[PDB]
């Protein structure tokens, strides 16, 4: 997007070096004779002079005669073409070269030329844009090494005398050097003695490229993830330096730039197909083995502190594990940056709220409502991390009335074949009381619960009935919040009975084991053992959830009583999103 | 939304804040399978068939608890008619500020979505001024947000109101109570005590930090209603309303703006200079003051435009270098209003100096200053090439002057080429032995014209101004007719840097149309200096009455813009 200014003088020759693809303008009113208004331009075969007037060729030399000097080919000898500016004679010698820097700019996964739209000047969000994508090395302390790196090729086409008085430099801005590492490849073999040229210690390297046709390749990799200080963009640059006289400082002629964006960390919701179970009671383990066998997923024996997300690039997609203070060749630990634990984090299935579409879902974590002395909040650094990665926007719910403080204690997402496709499950202290009252009216009012009290005591303990009220006005507030940022109607909210007992520091804890914290392996489910009244063979408590979930198509098993699950990445690719 | 669930066993109570949707759920607890409304409520339905949403709306805030009543009847042949009684209470709570950016508190009767900030010619948001500096200064610059409540007199014995700022933006906001701090850098939350009836509480707001690297500049203040009906149990939240604020950025003023006041620090040995600058003060009207690299700007809010000073009431701003030769304030310049490839920058673009590519001696501005000036999106930075100079400021070869035709401004770039043209044409018409440097080496024009070592140094310099010329042409979207080439001469010295040969003229003092210009002590031809005639014949046709001084720092404050920054769309 640069242009040169070759100011021609009619009393001495002028020599120029223009790079093809640059609007070269030959300014005339620089040393022209005071008299006359008819100069003309006698050109040469190798130069296309597209002279136009202000918005042979006997043109009036009024101020504003724009002259252009676009050419065709790369010179094989200095001064191949010539220009004459008559005055009724100015001489101009000219030589040309071809410098280019082309990475994967159209995001096709190839080495596409830099001639794409808008070249490589800015990153533009959306399905119609330009800009290459880099990966952070998910590694801890040849072909296999280069399988996870980009490839920037520098093609030089210069005559065989050009690089005795010229050179090139490759540089990265001093503010961003700690976040890029550029390897270099020798022409002997694609993988032969690769050493770093630019990195966190040397921000500018003087290349040596011999004259003539020559295309040599760099590999590029990142070193850090998006964060508060780091928006996500790196800029690499080439520069041609003229060093004709060996007694004066060098000068700049040509500067080509390429922009890169660092791939972010994306989580996987519960509504995606499974790929592997990294398991850590022997009966529970046997039940998990049966559940995996019925779901034909790979189970490995060696813990809710990590989430197996992925980093997506046009060439490769790599799983990544993030844990707050299984390996193989591809996993990596992010080291970027009760309420601050990792249980307070769930990513929602694909949703579209308020017209704007969020193809990758929305991240959900919990905090308090009014900051106070005794309020527990998520660590600010991790919040800023998960907000810096804008592919999944943060959503803040209310979890400070629970002793544990996690969010998974009262919400969960399951698949569905009809309506939207995903069903939101909310714990409800209200449906269980209605079920117990109905069972009492049906004739059973002395049942054995936790077999430990009877249904009578549970339905006549006034303190419990007053406690569940406050634990019902908070899940309702979370419900109204979830129905505003996810655009959920009243039909996609299934209620799962689960009582609470306000006893510990006036906080909330479950009465019988939670039925909302489930284990979803594709279509199949694993639900904790809800000890409850055994009314007519089957238990009443383990009947409502079955009758509420089975008609969808989902199955429900009941494990008597911490395994991580990896899920396939999204088919939608984040560089097509428009945040 | 506020879902209200009525039970057919016992009556239910509820409090509603007016202006918010209030649906009631009725299919959930209905016995079997298949509404009397009082004057104070409105009931409507739009598709006990599951999914029949029914909504309630109010007309006015209640007078006493449970005056308006809604009865839902489950009529049935098989099951005797059941009834659900819902005793509603209605209250009004509003928290409003200058959301529509006029200048009034703009009492919002639920008309605007005050919970978002959007750049645009017309939209929603509140502007907050910084406190770069209670009986005074409270009625003038601190923003006003008012809280109006209409509730029964026996209602706040049970319900309490709290006000909270997020704990990540508490060192940057301070809220005072009208006759006194309630929130600030130590107390995220305050518990207000609002009586019954009606009560308009006035809240004053101030900020404490300019937009920077970590602060995007968006403070949100929120009111919450808490139900303290019981004493053993903790309370729950029922209603939350918020107002968003944006911190006013630091804007700089370019050359073309007419002056308001001209400052100086002249003490002694100035002599003629002072007289000369004073002469300008009377010709181009200014207020001339009299008693070190500071730069003057302003901050704008719909209640006040305040002049501020950036150093390295008036106050000061210090958010940058918490320094090399390029971090001084002569390195920063502001372009007049500009248009680039369609996108219009009505307030101009900042220009700063930096090298081309990093090396062992690529002196660059401290990254704190660059990121501070890029946090203010009002005037986006443009990185020039000013490393070849010893001092390295960009004021040594470029400057803008007010033009009355075409675009409106003239960019004056130094050009070593034109001075050779002047001397060559002068010698082509005789008298080619004129003297030069008459001030205080009296080298002849012939010696300068025949020198074989100055030409290389000037050629290299001409290879550097062209690059900045092309960069400016692309970035600012200019053409050839807006660039004048003042003659100047350069000479390379030790450490291979460039310094002016005879005193520079591009660093000129612009008092409107009037121009104070330092003197090229040079040739004496025909009676008037040649370096004093090219500039005249190039500038005076614009109308600028050029004057020549014998140069000293004179900072000039210039009148703020007409185009407001909130109207911009970055």
Author numbering:
A (entry chain B): 2 to 56, 65 to 97, 105 to 157, 173 to 311, 316 to 337, 349 to 371, 384 to 395, 403 to 516, ...
B (entry chain A): 4 to 37, 42 to 54, 70 to 155, 172 to 217, 226 to 337, 350 to 370, 388 to 397, 401 to 518, ...
From the paper:
To explain the lower activatory potential of shorter oligomers, we determined the structure of PAD4 with Dp12 in the absence of calcium. This structure also contained two face-to-back dimers of PAD4, similar to the Dp20-bound structure, but they were connected by a single Dp12 and angled differently (approximately 73° in the x–y plane and approximately 38° in the z–x plane). The Dp12 oligomer was again bound proximal to the region spanning a loop including R123 to R137 of the bottom dimer. In addition, one more Dp12 molecule could reside in loop R123–R137 on the distal side of the top dimer, possibly allowing for the formation of longer PAD4 dimer chains. These structures were observed in the micrographs as a separate 2D class. By plotting the maximum PAD4 activation and Ca0.5 versus (vs) oligomer length, we determined that approximately 12 sugar subunits in the GAG chain are necessary to achieve half of the effects of native heparin.
Citrullination, the loss of a positive charge on the arginine side chain to form citrulline, is catalyzed by peptidylarginine deiminase 4 (PAD4) of the PAD enzyme family. The active form of PAD4 is a homodimer, and dimerization greatly affects enzyme activity because monomeric mutants are less active.
